[PDB]
Amino acid sequence: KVFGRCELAAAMKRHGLDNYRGYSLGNWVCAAKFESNFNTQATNRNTDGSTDYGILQINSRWWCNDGRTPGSRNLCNIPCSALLSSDITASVNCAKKIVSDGNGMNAWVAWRNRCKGTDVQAWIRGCRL
Ligand SMILES: [Cl-]
Numbered sequence: 093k094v095f096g097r098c099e100l101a102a103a104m105k106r107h108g109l110d111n112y113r114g115y116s117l118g119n120w121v122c123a124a125k126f127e128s129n130f131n132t133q134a135t136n137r138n139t140d141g142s143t144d145y146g147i148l149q150i151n152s153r154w155w156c157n158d159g160r161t162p163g164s165r166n167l168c169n170i171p172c173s174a175l176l177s178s179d180i181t182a183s184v185n186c187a188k189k190i191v192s193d194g195n196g197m198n199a200w201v202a203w204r205n206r207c208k209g210t211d212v213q214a215w216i217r218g219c220r221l
C-alpha cells in the first residue's frame with residue numbers, strides 16, 4: 093500500500109507513535125517518507141547483506157527474520173514479510189522497540205540525515221488528526 097501523508101500520520105497516531113519516546117508525529121512521518129516513500133512494500137538490500145523492510149525500513153540484521161541474514165537476530169519476533177503488510181501494526185510495534193534501544197531515532201540514518209532538527213511539523217500540515 094502507498095499511504096498518503098495524512099493517512100499515514102493518522103495510522104501512526106492511532107498506533108501510539110505520536111510522542112513515543114518523545115518523538116512527535118512529524119518525526120515518524122518524515123522518517124517514513126525518506127525510508128519508504130510511504131510504501132509498505134518497500135524492500136532494500138543493505139551492504140552488509142541484511143535487508144530493510146516496509147514503511148520504516150526495518151532491518152533483518154537485528155529486528156525481523158528473513159532467513160537470509162547470517163548471524164542476525166529477530167528481536168521483534170516477526171517474519172520480515174509481516175513488515176510489508178497494508179496494516180502497519182507490526183512495523184509500528186517493531187519501531188517502538190527500535191527507538192527504545194538507546195539511540196532514539198538515530199537508529200534510522202535517513203531520519204538523522206534528513207529529518208533531525210528540521211521543521212518536522214510540516215509533515216502533518218493540513219491533516220485532520
Ligand atoms: Cl509527501
Ligand SMILES: [Cl-]
Pocket residue numbers: 116117118119212213214216
Ligand atoms: Cl510534529
Ligand SMILES: [Cl-]
Pocket residue numbers: 157158159160161162163164
Ligand atoms: Cl537469517
Ligand SMILES: [Cl-]
Pocket residue numbers: 113114195196197
Ligand atoms: Cl531520544
Ligand code: NA
Pocket residue numbers: 144149151
Ligand atoms: Na536502512
Ligand code: NA
Pocket residue numbers: 151152153154155156157158161164165166
Ligand atoms: Na534477522
Ligand code: NA
Pocket residue numbers: 093132133176177178179
Ligand atoms: Na502491503
